[PDB]
Amino acid sequence: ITPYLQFNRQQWGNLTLTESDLDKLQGQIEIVSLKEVTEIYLPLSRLLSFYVTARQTLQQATYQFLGKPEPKVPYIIGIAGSVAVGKSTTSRVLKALLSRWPDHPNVEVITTDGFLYSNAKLEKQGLMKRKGFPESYDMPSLLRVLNAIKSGQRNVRIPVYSHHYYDIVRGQYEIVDQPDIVILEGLNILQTGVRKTLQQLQVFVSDFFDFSLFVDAQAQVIQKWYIDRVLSFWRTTFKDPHSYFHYLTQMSETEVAAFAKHVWNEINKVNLMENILPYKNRAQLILEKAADHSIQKVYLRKI
Amino acid sequence: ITPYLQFNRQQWGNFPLTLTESDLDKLQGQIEIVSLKEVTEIYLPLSRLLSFYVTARQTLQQATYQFLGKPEPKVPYIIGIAGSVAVGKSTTSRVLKALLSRWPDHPNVEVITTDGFLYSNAKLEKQGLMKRKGFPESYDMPSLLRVLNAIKSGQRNVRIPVYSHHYYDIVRGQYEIVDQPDIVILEGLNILQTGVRKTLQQLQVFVSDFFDFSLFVDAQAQVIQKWYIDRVLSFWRTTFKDPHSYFHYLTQMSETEVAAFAKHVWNEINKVNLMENILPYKNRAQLILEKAADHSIQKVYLRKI
Numbered sequence A: 001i002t003p004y005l006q007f008n009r010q011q012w013g014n015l016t017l018t019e020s021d022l023d024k025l026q027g028q029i030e031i032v033s034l035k036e037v038t039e040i041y042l043p044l045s046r047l048l049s050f051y052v053t054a055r056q057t058l059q060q061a062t063y064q065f066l067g068k069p070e071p072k073v074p075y076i077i078g079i080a081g082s083v084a085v086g087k088s089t090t091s092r093v094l095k096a097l098l099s100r101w102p103d104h105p106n107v108e109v110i111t112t113d114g115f116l117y118s119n120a121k122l123e124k125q126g127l128m129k130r131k132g133f134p135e136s137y138d139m140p141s142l143l144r145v146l147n148a149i150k151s152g153q154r155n156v157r158i159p160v161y162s163h164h165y166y167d168i169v170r171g172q173y174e175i176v177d178q179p180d181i182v183i184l185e186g187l188n189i190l191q192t193g194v195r196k197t198l199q200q201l202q203v204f205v206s207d208f209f210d211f212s213l214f215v216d217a218q219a220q221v222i223q224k225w226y227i228d229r230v231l232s233f234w235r236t237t238f239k240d241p242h243s244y245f246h247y248l249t250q251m252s253e254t255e256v257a258a259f260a261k262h263v264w265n266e267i268n269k270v271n272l273m274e275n276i277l278p279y280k281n282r283a284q285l286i287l288e289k290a291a292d293h294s295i296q297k298v299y300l301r302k303i
Numbered sequence B: 001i002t003p004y005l006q007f008n009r010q011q012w013g014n015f016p017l018t019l020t021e022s023d024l025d026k027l028q029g030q031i032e033i034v035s036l037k038e039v040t041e042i043y044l045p046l047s048r049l050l051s052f053y054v055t056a057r058q059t060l061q062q063a064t065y066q067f068l069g070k071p072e073p074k075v076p077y078i079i080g081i082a083g084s085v086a087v088g089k090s091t092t093s094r095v096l097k098a099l100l101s102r103w104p105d106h107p108n109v110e111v112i113t114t115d116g117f118l119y120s121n122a123k124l125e126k127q128g129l130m131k132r133k134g135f136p137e138s139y140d141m142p143s144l145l146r147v148l149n150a151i152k153s154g155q156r157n158v159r160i161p162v163y164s165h166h167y168y169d170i171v172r173g174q175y176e177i178v179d180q181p182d183i184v185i186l187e188g189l190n191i192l193q194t195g196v197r198k199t200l201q202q203l204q205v206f207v208s209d210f211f212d213f214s215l216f217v218d219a220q221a222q223v224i225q226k227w228y229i230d231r232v233l234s235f236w237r238t239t240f241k242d243p244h245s246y247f248h249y250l251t252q253m254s255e256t257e258v259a260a261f262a263k264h265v266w267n268e269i270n271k272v273n274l275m276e277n278i279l280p281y282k283n284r285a286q287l288i289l290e291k292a293a294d295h296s297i298q299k300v301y302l303r304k305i
């Protein structure tokens, strides 16, 4: 007994990329592969479009019925999963693909790491080894942004987090202006809030989105992707003397891998097990990845 | 600003929706309580609004399953109804059950009360929780989630445990049957809440993960208090006379004494529950029906889509 439709890869294979798709997918096709974009994310994007389009139709039928002239608000798709599981990559692929459909061409990504407390604030509270954990986020700010978007507010400012500087970038904002679809990606989007008091009003990030995807893989597999991501930066980004992690460039490859493994085991893996995984089954759609990133199983809530 | 469309009564009436003899028949016992006016003006169009959501989900199911190449049938659309003790959610669910069933895309409508998933008095007593009936720790949550999970898995003939307000207890060996209807109306105090984290690592799903839409019925605490006190007084004059009623000893109290008792229970039990466990989750609802003291709906909030 299961509340999910279940597909292996062949079953998912029961639509074609245009020059336009390839262009919007630039730099991401190399990472994800033409095969995988074609066989998985393109159909995924079509499936998600059925949902977005259904919601648009409902909005129009109900607002006509209710005699409200108010315009639609965005359909928000949540992308959750461990650090390094591929949330950002998936969000970029889907942003490019979802935008090919004429009923929802305007598609934006919001990452929740923009709502991390700054290092200075984390450092003061002794939370620097807890980035990504619930207590490391400005939740009121996140909920305020999601509330704004779902209230139809124009030109909502999104704060920005630089992985390069490992910190919030003061005075830097992306603008999300009532697009058709928001892809909200983050570690923490399926979690609930901290109850300061019993009587404090409680809403969750999920109360502001319509559909969630969880990207799953085995912990040992994600570890390797994480170490490899760190290593890739070690060979490129971290050479910048202004990079937060420039000091890793003085370490040998083996030493960066060990340090990567250490950060994985004491920070991101604990976060995964304590704060991310437990909320996996709140997702409407679970993408299960093999070690090579290929999607080998999709779960989709029955409707 | 606001994630809700807002309607006063005039605006709600600015929505051909005429009660039929069949509606009238299905509403028997409820029409006398809620009144023809209120049913016609609020609940009928409310049911039509909800019909849009259910039939949309049905259409989505048909289109996506065609595209996904899946032959599995739909599962039920589940509408949550939450609110304080005595705010009128049982009344609301029965009215909506009758009205929602009039549409041929979803004539099969069932109501699940969360009361049925309360622990028995004997279990509550052992754990000292008889003063906490309706609080989260008083419910068999794994049992409720198993039932919702089963419904949302397409399972046939799901057995729902039954609570008697008369006996103030679960009725042993008694089950209602929910059998893949088109709509399940899920009513109870706790449907917008979250589970307790026994451990951090424990898998977490909420009741809300098994429903599609939720209504919260709201009113001033002082107002609900009065509805509560009247409801108990009403039973004191009728149902509690039965020597096998749980609260039969209340018949020995004066009309004023039982009122004082009812006021006490509200103040120390139900109102604390409202303030601590129900009202904090009000804003999770898609639709909030706001009642005036006479029960008439004076404001409707509906999440913007």
Ligand SMILES: Nc1ncnc2c1ncn2[C@@H]1O[C@H](COP(=O)(O)OP(=O)(O)O)[C@@H](O)[C@H]1O
Binding pocket: A031, A032, A033, A036, A081, A082, A083, A084, A085, A086, A087, A088, A089, A090, A225, A226, A228, A229, A292, A293, A294
């Ligand atoms: N579908 C994929 N195919 C191949 N590599 C991928 C895929 N998704 C992610 N990656 C790689 O895995 C690592 C983690 O991806 P990322 O999207 O940065 O994860 P997250 O955003 O969850 O932290 C990156 O090095 C990325 O290049």
Ligand SMILES: Nc1ncnc2c1ncn2[C@@H]1O[C@H](COP(=O)(O)OP(=O)(O)O)[C@@H](O)[C@H]1O
Binding pocket: B033, B034, B035, B038, B083, B084, B085, B086, B087, B088, B089, B090, B091, B092, B227, B231, B294, B295, B296
């Ligand atoms: N719409 C309404 N109009 C008039 N009376 C109502 C209405 N809704 C509920 N009531 C009355 O208020 C009291 C509480 O209703 P009930 O549905 O039993 O509350 P709940 O199920 O939330 O405990 C009952 O005495 C009921 O008759």
